[PDB]
Design a protein around this motif. Structure first.
Motif, PDB file in Angstrom:
ATOM      1  N   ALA A  14     -38.302 -73.512  31.546  1.00  0.00           N
ATOM      2  CA  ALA A  14     -36.941 -73.277  32.007  1.00  0.00           C
ATOM      3  C   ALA A  14     -36.927 -72.221  33.104  1.00  0.00           C
ATOM      4  O   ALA A  14     -37.487 -71.132  32.941  1.00  0.00           O
ATOM      5  N   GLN A  15     -36.278 -72.541  34.219  1.00  0.00           N
ATOM      6  CA  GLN A  15     -36.168 -71.642  35.360  1.00  0.00           C
ATOM      7  C   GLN A  15     -34.718 -71.212  35.522  1.00  0.00           C
ATOM      8  O   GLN A  15     -33.817 -72.056  35.569  1.00  0.00           O
ATOM      9  N   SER A  16     -34.560 -69.903  35.652  1.00  0.00           N
ATOM     10  CA  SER A  16     -33.243 -69.340  35.797  1.00  0.00           C
ATOM     11  C   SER A  16     -32.681 -69.444  37.178  1.00  0.00           C
ATOM     12  O   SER A  16     -33.365 -69.203  38.167  1.00  0.00           O
ATOM     13  N   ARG A  17     -31.436 -69.832  37.244  1.00  0.00           N
ATOM     14  CA  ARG A  17     -30.716 -69.880  38.507  1.00  0.00           C
ATOM     15  C   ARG A  17     -29.771 -68.691  38.574  1.00  0.00           C
ATOM     16  O   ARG A  17     -28.977 -68.473  37.653  1.00  0.00           O
ATOM     17  N   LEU A  18     -29.814 -67.841  39.666  1.00  0.00           N
ATOM     18  CA  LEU A  18     -28.989 -66.652  39.814  1.00  0.00           C
ATOM     19  C   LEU A  18     -27.533 -66.981  40.114  1.00  0.00           C
ATOM     20  O   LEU A  18     -26.656 -66.159  39.834  1.00  0.00           O
ATOM     21  N   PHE A  19     -27.254 -68.158  40.666  1.00  0.00           N
ATOM     22  CA  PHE A  19     -25.912 -68.499  41.109  1.00  0.00           C
ATOM     23  C   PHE A  19     -25.541 -69.896  40.644  1.00  0.00           C
ATOM     24  O   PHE A  19     -26.400 -70.765  40.480  1.00  0.00           O
ATOM     25  N   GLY A  20     -24.246 -70.099  40.434  1.00  0.00           N
ATOM     26  CA  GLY A  20     -23.670 -71.411  40.281  1.00  0.00           C
ATOM     27  C   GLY A  20     -23.004 -71.866  41.563  1.00  0.00           C
ATOM     28  O   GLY A  20     -23.282 -71.357  42.654  1.00  0.00           O
ATOM     29  N   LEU A  21     -22.108 -72.837  41.433  1.00  0.00           N
ATOM     30  CA  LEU A  21     -21.332 -73.272  42.585  1.00  0.00           C
ATOM     31  C   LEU A  21     -20.375 -72.162  43.008  1.00  0.00           C
ATOM     32  O   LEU A  21     -19.673 -71.585  42.173  1.00  0.00           O
ATOM     33  N   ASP A  22     -20.355 -71.862  44.303  1.00  0.00           N
ATOM     34  CA  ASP A  22     -19.513 -70.791  44.811  1.00  0.00           C
ATOM     35  C   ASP A  22     -18.038 -71.132  44.638  1.00  0.00           C
ATOM     36  O   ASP A  22     -17.615 -72.265  44.878  1.00  0.00           O
ATOM     37  N   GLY A  23     -17.254 -70.137  44.225  1.00  0.00           N
ATOM     38  CA  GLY A  23     -15.845 -70.345  43.948  1.00  0.00           C
ATOM     39  C   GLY A  23     -14.965 -70.458  45.173  1.00  0.00           C
ATOM     40  O   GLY A  23     -13.809 -70.871  45.041  1.00  0.00           O
ATOM     41  N   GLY A  24     -15.468 -70.096  46.350  1.00  0.00           N
ATOM     42  CA  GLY A  24     -14.722 -70.328  47.569  1.00  0.00           C
ATOM     43  C   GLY A  24     -14.719 -71.800  47.919  1.00  0.00           C
ATOM     44  O   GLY A  24     -15.746 -72.344  48.329  1.00  0.00           O
ATOM     45  N   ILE A  25     -13.578 -72.458  47.759  1.00  0.00           N
ATOM     46  CA  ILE A  25     -13.532 -73.912  47.890  1.00  0.00           C
ATOM     47  C   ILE A  25     -13.218 -74.336  49.316  1.00  0.00           C
ATOM     48  O   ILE A  25     -13.864 -75.238  49.856  1.00  0.00           O
ATOM     49  N   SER A  26     -12.229 -73.706  49.944  1.00  0.00           N
ATOM     50  CA  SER A  26     -11.802 -74.115  51.274  1.00  0.00           C
ATOM     51  C   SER A  26     -12.922 -73.914  52.284  1.00  0.00           C
ATOM     52  O   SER A  26     -13.508 -72.830  52.372  1.00  0.00           O
ATOM     53  N   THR A  27     -13.221 -74.969  53.045  1.00  0.00           N
ATOM     54  CA  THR A  27     -14.192 -74.902  54.128  1.00  0.00           C
ATOM     55  C   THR A  27     -13.576 -75.106  55.502  1.00  0.00           C
ATOM     56  O   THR A  27     -14.157 -74.657  56.494  1.00  0.00           O
ATOM     57  N   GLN A  28     -12.422 -75.764  55.585  1.00  0.00           N
ATOM     58  CA  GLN A  28     -11.749 -75.982  56.852  1.00  0.00           C
ATOM     59  C   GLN A  28     -10.952 -74.740  57.250  1.00  0.00           C
ATOM     60  O   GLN A  28     -10.847 -73.766  56.499  1.00  0.00           O
ATOM     61  N   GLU A  29     -10.387 -74.776  58.450  1.00  0.00           N
ATOM     62  CA  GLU A  29      -9.524 -73.717  58.949  1.00  0.00           C
ATOM     63  C   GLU A  29      -8.071 -74.159  58.857  1.00  0.00           C
ATOM     64  O   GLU A  29      -7.759 -75.339  59.051  1.00  0.00           O
ATOM     65  N   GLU A  30      -7.190 -73.212  58.555  1.00  0.00           N
ATOM     66  CA  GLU A  30      -5.776 -73.529  58.417  1.00  0.00           C
ATOM     67  C   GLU A  30      -5.193 -73.974  59.754  1.00  0.00           C
ATOM     68  O   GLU A  30      -5.487 -73.399  60.805  1.00  0.00           O
ATOM     69  N   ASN A  31      -4.360 -75.011  59.704  1.00  0.00           N
ATOM     70  CA  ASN A  31      -3.695 -75.534  60.893  1.00  0.00           C
ATOM     71  C   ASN A  31      -2.431 -74.719  61.138  1.00  0.00           C
ATOM     72  O   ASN A  31      -1.454 -74.832  60.390  1.00  0.00           O
TER      73      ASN A  31
END
Lengths: 53, 53
Positions: A14-31
């Protein structure tokens, strides 16, 4: 010896992962662009350089 | 950015006019001509060059 063998068998590889999926969801820029009734379409303000022929 | 977009949307393509309708109304010239009972008509003093036949 028995306890160490049991621990090795239970942990396996078993190998440990330091991070999960990042909680910052938005990737686009606001219009921030306006939208008026003079716009030719919801996405284009005008068709300035367009030539009919 | 939001304020500038709101100003652009509100102003739209309004073009300023420097002048309205000019207040000088009269365009004709004042009629200073006399009118006597000898006149053949209100608009003609005589019919001098007229030939009956």
């Amino acid at each position: 010896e028995a306890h160490i063998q049991m621990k090795a068998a239970a942990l396996k590889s078993a190998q440990s992962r330091l991070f999960g999926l990042d909680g910052g969801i938005s990737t686009q820029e606001e219009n921030t662009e306006r939208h008026t009734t003079e716009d030719v379409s919801p996405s284009m303000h005008t068709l300035l350089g367009v030539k009919n022929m």
